[PDB]
Amino acid sequence: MQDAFTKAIVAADLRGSFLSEQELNQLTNLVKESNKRLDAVNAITGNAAEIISDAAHKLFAEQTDLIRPGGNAYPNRRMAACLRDMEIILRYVSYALLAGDASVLEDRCLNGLKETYVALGTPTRSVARAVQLMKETAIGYVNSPSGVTRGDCSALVNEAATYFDKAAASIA
Amino acid sequence: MQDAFTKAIVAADLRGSFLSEQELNQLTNLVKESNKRLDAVNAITGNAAEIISDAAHKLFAEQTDLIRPGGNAYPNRRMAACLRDMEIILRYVSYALLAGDASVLEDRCLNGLKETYVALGTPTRSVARAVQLMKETAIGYVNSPSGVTRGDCSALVNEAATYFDKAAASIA
Amino acid sequence: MQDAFTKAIVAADLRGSFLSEQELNQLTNLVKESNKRLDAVNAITGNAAEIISDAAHKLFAEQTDLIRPGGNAYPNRRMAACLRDMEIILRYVSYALLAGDASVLEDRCLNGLKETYVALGTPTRSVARAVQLMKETAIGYVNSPSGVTRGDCSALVNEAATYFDKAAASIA
Amino acid sequence: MYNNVTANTEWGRKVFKITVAQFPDADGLDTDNLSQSNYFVTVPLARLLPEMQLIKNKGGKVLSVEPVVS
Amino acid sequence: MKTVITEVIASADSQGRFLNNTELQAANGRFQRATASMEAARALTSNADSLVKGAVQEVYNKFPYLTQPGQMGYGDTNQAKCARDISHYLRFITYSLVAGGTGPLDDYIVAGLREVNRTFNLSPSWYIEALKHIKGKVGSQLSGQPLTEANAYIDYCINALS
């Protein structure tokens, strides 16, 4: 598994080199913003259930076919599987966010996922949408939390978004 | 698993026949040369480590890219993986040599091996070469050993070579 | 598994109570001395091999019967087992030292150990001695290390000793 | 001793000891490699009910339970 | 019992390995963090009495019907066992604060929660609402990293119940 430092190290090694002063300071900056990062990961963990629930309510509000017989979130067994997948993806997105690298998300979650869903008959476009809704709400929470010091988290909100967007793209 | 006798038996059975006087004497000759065969297998066993080591030293002497970063025998684990594969192949070649048949080599070692290496990014041409070097040194030992009775081992040296050459061909 | 805090918590809970101001400050002090504790655990980790080696050299210097045929550290297989056990015990002592509680040592290492050795015919008094020697050298290292800030580590040296002494007592 | 490192919860830390005597069930001759039917397993507290369930499920007889960790 | 210390030790042990710089760095986090944690712990400890009575009442104010006869917020024994239960939660929150991890919560409240609540006809909604209220008031007893810690664990209980 990689994190943002480990990634630097792998690229340096492929040159046969000690880390460039370029790369050093990029990593010094990651340490600089790490308290914000911890709050951002904490924002997701602290509202995981609601993020999934709210995404869910809204997914089925839009796509009332999934909860009809014939639909891929019917009966209870399938809805529980769908709720479970929402949690799994939100989980690996939070891991990537602590790590500063998408690899755990791509390697443990996204790799093969689309082909799984197609084999199953699970409508990937609906799954992509559920991921887009989780993103909206998750970032909502990253941006408006309990008595965190006031500052600018937009860099981290972007990065979190790209992890949500990776997952969506990979699946649709 | 087959040996040279077992092979005879399978071909006889496919005719529905007791072994031909042809096949009988071919096998009587294998028994005739079996002390030499035991010395030949013993030559390899008794120098396995040096055969691998010497092949290795020479492989990396020729192909200094493998031991640079980016190279398939770098860092220490990859080199350790490359050093037994050398051992594994030398091992199945010695088994074939005791058996008088290549099947154990083809079935337990060579089958799928090329596609493994390609999946891994292991340069098959380099692996083929490492096998060619093991052959040179192994045969060296088969031909010039400790106080073995003097005679002609060229038939066995050829046969050992074909096992080394099978492996090389199969992999490159 | 317990650490020094977890232990406090279990005793509090058995009263049905929030932690006593008594217990709170005992734990505040553990946090106060924690940098020293980290150096103490680091002293052992950084010299584990030598601690085992030096204990060993000295154990067999004293008890030359163990390395004779008939002796419990003869032949190579048994010596490797004995060297391995020295490492295992030093390892759980270092864990206890990071934790501020002996429980991991007692539960994962010492529990049943004496009866194992007796079943095996392993002389427990010799094992106890090997533990006493590890203690001497380990503490040596805790007390005289590389450019650590000067201060008083005797409280921690005592506590480390009691873990070594627990193990010795439990085994002899 | 036992299996050693367990789960990190306190309810995984407690390992117990079971001496059994498995019986030949019914229905079939075992011609494979057989073992003497006594034995003992050390099982952590978190697992225990599946293990005792499959022990008494296969005609077994639990002879002793022992508190070895706790 | 899950703490930063027990976790790194567990991970070392399971690989048959001495604690190394990775594991000691981790431990320093837990020790550096103790001050904020333990401030939250002391504030939650001395306000316990009122935090509990505040949350108990709020369960009845949000679920008015509970306090009518034939219901589970009626009579001394239900209302007594309620205060006790919220008190258990606050107690384990302080323990988790002091311990440096969720262990006390995981072992004494989370493991088994739903089975128990389901057999006894206890709705999680009450408990979430008790905790949401406790979270509101703890906003003005603490601030900075002690508040973040208090929040971390209160929210952890709310997610355990959803």
Add this chain to the structure above:
Amino acid sequence: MKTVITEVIASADSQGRFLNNTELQAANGRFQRATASMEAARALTSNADSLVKGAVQEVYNKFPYLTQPGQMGYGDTNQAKCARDISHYLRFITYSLVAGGTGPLDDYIVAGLREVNRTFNLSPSWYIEALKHIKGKVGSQLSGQPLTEANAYIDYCINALS
């Protein structure tokens, strides 16, 4: 690749669990520790050239016979491959410093070490003595927690080789 960050994530994943306060406390350790680590890294990085030549020579001064003909410290190629190898070690030490764990050392030097050294007739003693020397000189390039970090990883290599 073992870092504090990857370790806590691995432990969460394997229990199917979001990162909680236990795991985030751990991460803070790794981030709080980065300054000392990275100071050690910068000092080891710019002195690399001389640290390597110093240790290479010390291998010959401690094992004089290595530099005689027919031996493995003789001729341009042996002496070249030696400098390179110590340079590999210092490189991975800096990586381990920057990464917040032993991962780079574990994955690129420790995994396989003995098999390789045994096939190639390389004695660990040389490498320990190279590292003991590097440890002596790093005593005056750094101090405080940067030195402790440098030491942690140098010692880690010496234990890997014993």
Add this chain to the structure above:
Amino acid sequence: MKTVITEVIASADSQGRFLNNTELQAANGRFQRATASMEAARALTSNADSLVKGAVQEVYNKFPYLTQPGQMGYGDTNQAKCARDISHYLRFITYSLVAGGTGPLDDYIVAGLREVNRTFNLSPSWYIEALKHIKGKVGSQLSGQPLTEANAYIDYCINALS
């Protein structure tokens, strides 16, 4: 296919190990033994025709009733398939003699024997009696270690059928 050679190779392979003096000593046994084995093989090979007709008849002489109508020793096809079957056994005996082990017998006659015989209403007793007779006559075609070898394998078939 089980021979001394395949057995020792199997045992080496499964421990990831080169053939050593233990395994080569074993192989020498198999090679030293080939002369007696192969003499038995040649004698059984050229007498096959009559050994088969002798044993076939003996099955009818020992189980007279088999040759009456409505029975399984009656008509050209039963009596033909019988000769064939004994011929199969003698064939695999010669193969086992030549191969240096029971492999050919194990793989081509023993594996599955009872299931087949049970579905087709073939009594092992016949086959044992065919083999007992073949054993009687092979007493005067061979002697010494060739006879011991012939016996070893005939008896092996009789035990497979009991």
Add this chain to the structure above:
Amino acid sequence: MKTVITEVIASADSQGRFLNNTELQAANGRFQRATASMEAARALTSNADSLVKGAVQEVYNKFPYLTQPGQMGYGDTNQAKCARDISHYLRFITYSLVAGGTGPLDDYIVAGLREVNRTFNLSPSWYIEALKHIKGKVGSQLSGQPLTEANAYIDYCINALS
């Protein structure tokens, strides 16, 4: 303890099977081979004293520096423990010769070898050079199949140490 006899018995037992012609052929190899083996054993046994002193010295002649002060070939105790160790090797070689397999070597010297040598700072190179020398001199004490046997086991030790 690995011998031809124990190996074939192990293989039978593990398939729940009586010893058959395959396994008895194997055993005959081990018994036929005993004469050469045991001649090697007797020669190595009576020359033990000098074979050991010859190899001990050769370790110092090939690694001159070992015999200087502060080194591991200096003082009565090192030089005593060395003779002993080579004597252990020759002893197990004779045992392996007599036993008909590598068992005694595998169980008493190979299992654990590297761990022990690594903890005690014993270089395999010495031991290989002791054995290479013993191999040189055993060239004129034996010949034919006794020499081949002696060689088989000496070489087996040298490969165990590489």
Add this chain to the structure above:
Amino acid sequence: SVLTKAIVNADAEARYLSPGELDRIKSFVASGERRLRIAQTLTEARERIVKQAGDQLFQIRPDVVSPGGNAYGEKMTALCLRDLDYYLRLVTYGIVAGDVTPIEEIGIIGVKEMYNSLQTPIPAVAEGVRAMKNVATSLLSGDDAAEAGFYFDYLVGAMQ
């Protein structure tokens, strides 16, 4: 473009560009800014152009917008002007490319089969395009109006 066309002929005969081919690339690129201005003007008046084409069309063929007409009704007429908007767009592309490659792959190859299926009268689509020429051409200088006009007459030609 002019580039694509020149090159494809070059590569297909396994050769470097001719003096002729080089010359036309040069004359073409010199007209770049002018061609870009012609596209801008027309892009800037697109909504007006489509409309005046649409009036000119329904006078000339009131039937298409009649009981049995392909464009009869408010939303059968809405789609019809949208198609007129499509073709004006393609005409701006063609003018800036200096040939039809893009215009052709996007909107004439397959157009017979598409409209035959929909039962759209092709020759009245050609009229809608003439109508757009008339409007667009009245918003351009004489020289630019001619240059634009070639591309309008091409589309009119291809629907044939």
Add this chain to the structure above:
Amino acid sequence: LQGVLRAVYRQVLGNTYVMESERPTQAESLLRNGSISVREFVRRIAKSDLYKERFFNKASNNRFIELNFKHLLGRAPYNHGEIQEHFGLYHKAGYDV
């Protein structure tokens, strides 16, 4: 015991190789003691980081569940119900259960 350990490392770890540093040594001192059986030793390996890093840490749940069937049970997945049962257990109770 070495022959048993080699077969365990061949089967459970899926013919991938363990280096000399990766060897779980202190479980073997006990398996040689006889305090655990082969089944408990297999369970201890499959919960360790050797199995976890290779077959769990970089794959999806389908690959991981089908690799459990190959390593531990020695056979292939039979239907979709075997996979949809096991992953529900993984999400409910983690990797250790």
Add this chain to the structure above:
Amino acid sequence: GSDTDRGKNGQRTLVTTKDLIGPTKIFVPFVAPGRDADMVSGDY
């Protein structure tokens, strides 16, 4: 062969859940990206 990850595709899936459930029978989501709207009145 082995189930190693160190190749170019570290543990891509095999026996895909297109194997485990076999044939399909009926459905595609019959969705409407066809459009609807505008309203004028008269003359027809």
